[PDB]
């Protein structure tokens, strides 16, 4: 597989890369992102977000820093954990978490984390240039319905979606002060004005849920989320754009994730030529357990043939993850093409999976 971001040969002399992201553009351009983890694998470190862009279907790549941290702390300033979407205008939005101090974003403080913010950039030239950073949390003018007991929140790490009428929906994760503890939950945020302003949904039914993505299905939102220490990815459905949730049985509990903590993965919808809507999920099998996160696999469900069990399509990364930080992945599906980016021993690798989609599509 192509090494897209190479810890042993990159223009930033970065020691590590983590948290990859991919969008297949309507015109065939491939846009990807990654944390530039300059000094090593740690989350609590100095990080910027790179882009890598290809106009020859992944043969060659042009690299850039898509978003810089706040440059306040040479050890801890970081923007990281990209969540992206392409809107119906073709605008590309990236939302990242921003901090500049040591300590887990959700658990370190009992009040709103003072160095925390959510930063947005967008591109109206298909990822060639980016806006200035837009701070979504410094005031109350950009995001509605943020809870007063928020410790912090960020995107779900992956891709958002667009509803039938153009509404943008982004997966998110939040930490909330509740009865003298901090509990973290998945949720969504949505924008009806091309990302200028947002409204936050309500938390899903279970805590210990974090990184996630949602698909749209007949107006409903279906979320596949990391559910820590359950052994599986939870799934929930919302019929009111994320105000209420219930368990979605056909996917809940069906993708197992091994012993220990959960892991980020991706979840997207494709419509095959027979009209069926299928869900594709990427995540480590983690048969070896905890943070080994071996065998990043791709799974399929057919929402129009739900008695057929979830199927393992392929394993793009049939290797142990690096315990320092590995296992994350991102699928993108567009115009009958399917691509993946994933963590691979401190690098990011890229693969075109379109031949597997052809097998599924049965033309």
Residue numbers in the entry: 20 to 382
The authors write:
The genomes of most C. perfringens strains contain three separate genes encoding highly conserved GH33 CAZymes targeting sialic acid glycosidic linkages: the nonsecreted 43 kDa NanH, and the two secreted 77 kDa NanI and 129 kDa NanJ. Here, we present the structural and biochemical characterization of the GH33 catalytic domains of the three sialidases of C. perfringens and probe their substrate specificity. The catalytically active domains, which we refer to as NanHGH33, NanJGH33, and NanIGH33, displayed differential activity on various naturally occurring forms of sialic acid. We report the X-ray crystal structures of these domains in complex with relevant sialic acid variants revealing the molecular basis of how each catalytic domain accommodates different sialic acids.
NanH consists solely of the catalytic GH33 domain. The structures of NanHGH33 and NanJGH33 display the characteristic 6-bladed β-propeller fold seen in exo-acting sialidase GH33 domains. The inserted domain is not present in NanHGH33 and the RMSD of NanHGH33 with the other two structures is 1.7 Å. NanHGH33, however, has a considerably different organization in the active site region that interacts with the glycerol moiety, suggesting this may contribute to the ability of this enzyme to recognize additional acetylated variants of sialic acid. The most notable difference in NanH is in the loop structures surrounding the active site. In NanHGH33 loops on 3-blades forming the rim of one side of the cavity are extended, thus deepening the active site. The center blade of the three has a solvent exposed tyrosine residue, Y310, that projects into the active site. In contrast, NanH is predicted to be localized to the cytoplasm of the bacterium (i.e. it lacks any obvious export signals), suggesting it does not interact directly with the host. The biological role of NanH is more likely in processing glycans that are imported with their terminal sialic acids intact.
